[PDB]
Amino acid sequence: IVGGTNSSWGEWPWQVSLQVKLTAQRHLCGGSLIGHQWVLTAAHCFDGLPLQDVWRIYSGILNLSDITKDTPFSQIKEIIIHQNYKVSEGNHDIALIKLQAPLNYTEFQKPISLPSKGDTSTIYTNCWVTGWGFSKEKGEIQNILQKVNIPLVTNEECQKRYQDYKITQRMVCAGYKEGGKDACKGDSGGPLVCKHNGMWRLVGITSWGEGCARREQPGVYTKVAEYMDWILEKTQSSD
């Protein structure tokens, strides 16, 4: 996260860190707990290995440097990548992770609310993006979970900034014209959440953009509302 600030405990209790351990352990992506055994993230987080014994999923963690050998983590039972995701194209950048065991809910480990299958965001005037990603282009992972407040931008205005692609109704864009606040490398798969009437809810999944926090280059997010039929079908079927 570029231009953000350090979060406090309980602000973002759905945020998870998706890490891999081979010989060394590293944070690769964000994710959102959406149910007691389900995490929602980006499909592109799995380009590279989908052999899921490598993954360690940390929840209830605000500061990564706080992680030790004894810190509990979740393992992966199943990975469900959207059947129409193609890495080169970038459409349908969404994936579900089923955990090997359900998690007990606490003030620091709770699911984010999901939108209904057909909303518009114009009530979403207060949106935030979180993660442990770089604080600048060619930066490094941040220890304390970062938060940043970013305005949503219309797909028409987003499309102007990206003539090379492809801005569909299944994407949502957010950013500042002057730049300086944005998601960045390591923030993939994490939440774009908006607060409405005192309830938070998941509007987007951090996906792509040109560089980080550049002027007139907003962040592009998978629009969760447009995949709610898919999310319901896959999780009900698997359960």
Binding site: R26, L28, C29, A42, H44, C45, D47, G48, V87, S88, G90, D93, G133, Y165, A183, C184, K185, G186, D187, S188, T206, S207, W208, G209, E210
Partner: peptide
């Protein structure tokens, strides 16, 4: 995965 995506190795 392409340059525009945010995974570390994209």
């Amino acid at each position: 995965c392409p340059k525009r995506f945010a995974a570390l190795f994209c």
